[PDB]
Design a protein around this ligand. Structure first.
Ligand SMILES: O=C1N=Cc2ccc3c(-c4ccccc4)c[nH]c3c21
Length: 356
């Protein structure tokens, strides 16, 4: 079963050429393909060393900078693994890693669809509030654990949050004369630790996928754990309405959106930033008549107006979201404090105790 170097081949980009039935490490038998990315690909395997159980095996390209990145990812994942020996903090648990002819491979439990793919397959119809609450709780919990360990994820978004199981029932919406998929179990895991960064390491100027990037980062004021909290705020809005809070492609535009949605940037952050071009008279400067300006003006309104209903549940979700999307990161709610928010009184007990 041990593959000699003649049964191993890479495409031009350096991807391992894979086929169903191929073996790795005399242990993992490929039984399917789960997706591809810049880094490489993820395949489903049966782990024959463990009663044929299913795994997701992530295979990094055989390219210098990808392999080295992967080595940092493995360190993060090992620390998580060691600090959550009880399996209770909901970050993907690495079961094995190895170097396959220069491809770094990481083995995990096999999960379901990511929360973005589920949303897309539901035609961007949003998750119902109770699902939003359970998922938000799990996110606060998972990342409070990360933050306690001097780590920041830096790249949280819906595609990096995976359902344990994404089997659904199909329902019907009266109000919109269409079908709706509703996930049966809203248990989630936090994935993709490829950018996670220790407190002691070098902090690059820019982190996060744009739509999920906080103002401190755009303004280049430095960042830390508060970065993730902002991303979570953006994620919750997206789960609740089904569309991106900040559908943006440029910094000035992004800042205007923040202003229109959330109120004025604090002066103190404007005085502190070296990105003074975005400003004028201590005030954010932009062309309201440009394409981007007219887009922002048509489409970006006060945050509270996006509420779908007006009962307590919904009021509390918006209060938490507003606190998570506070401009000033030294004043933004922490996850420890987020877990005490009244929004979370509203959980079922199995949900809260993690009997889900
Ligand atoms: O089932 C899984 N358990 C862990 C895990 C991690 C990543 C993935 C991905 C994937 C695939 C392509 C790009 C990006 C991600 C699909 N399933 C995954 C799993």
């Amino acid at each position: 079963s041990k593959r000699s170097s003649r049964s191993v081949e890479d495409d031009k980009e350096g991807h391992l050429v894979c086929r169903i039935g191929d073996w790795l490490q005399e242990r993992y038998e490929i039984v399917g393909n789960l997706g591809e990315g810049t880094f490489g690909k993820v395949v489903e395997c049966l782990d024959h060393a463990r009663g044929k159980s299913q795994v997701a095996l992530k295979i990094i390209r055989n390219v210098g900078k990808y392999r080295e990145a992967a080595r940092l990812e493995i360190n993060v994942l090992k620390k998580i693994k060691e600090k959550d020996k009880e399996n209770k903090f909901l970050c993907v648990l690495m079961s094995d890693w190895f170097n396959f002819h220069g491809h770094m491979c990481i083995a995990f439990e096999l999960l379901g669809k990511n929360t973005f793919e589920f949303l897309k397959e539901n035609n961007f119809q949003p998750y119902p509030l109770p699902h939003v609450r359970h998922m938000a709780y799990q996110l606060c919990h998972a990342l409070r654990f990360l933050h306690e360990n001097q780590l920041t994820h830096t790249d949280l978004k819906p595609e990096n949050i995976l359902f344990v199981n994404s089997e659904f029932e199909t329902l019907y919406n009266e109000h919109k004369s269409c079908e709706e998929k509703s996930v049966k179990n809203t248990s989630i895991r936090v994935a993709d630790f490829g950018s996670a960064t220790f407190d002691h390491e070098h902090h690059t100027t820019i982190v996060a996928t744009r739509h999920y990037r906080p103002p401190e980062v755009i303004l280049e004021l430095g960042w830390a754990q508060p970065c993730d909290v902002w991303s979570i705020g953006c994620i919750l809005f997206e789960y609740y309405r089904g569309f991106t809070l900040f559908q943006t492609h440029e910094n000035r535009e992004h800042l205007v959106m923040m202003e229109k949605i959330l109120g004025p940037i604090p002066s103190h952050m404007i005085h502190r930033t070296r990105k003074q071009k975005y400003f004028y008279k201590g005030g954010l400067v932009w062309d309201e008549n440009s394409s981007d300006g007219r887009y922002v003006k048509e489409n970006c309104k006060p945050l509270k107006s996006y509420m779908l209903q007006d009962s307590l549940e919904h009021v509390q979700l918006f209060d938490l979201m507003r606190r998570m999307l506070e401009f000033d990161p030294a004043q933004r709610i922490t996850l420890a404090e987020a877990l005490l928010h009244p929004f979370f009184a509203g959980l079922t007990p199995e949900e809260r105790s993690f009997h889900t």
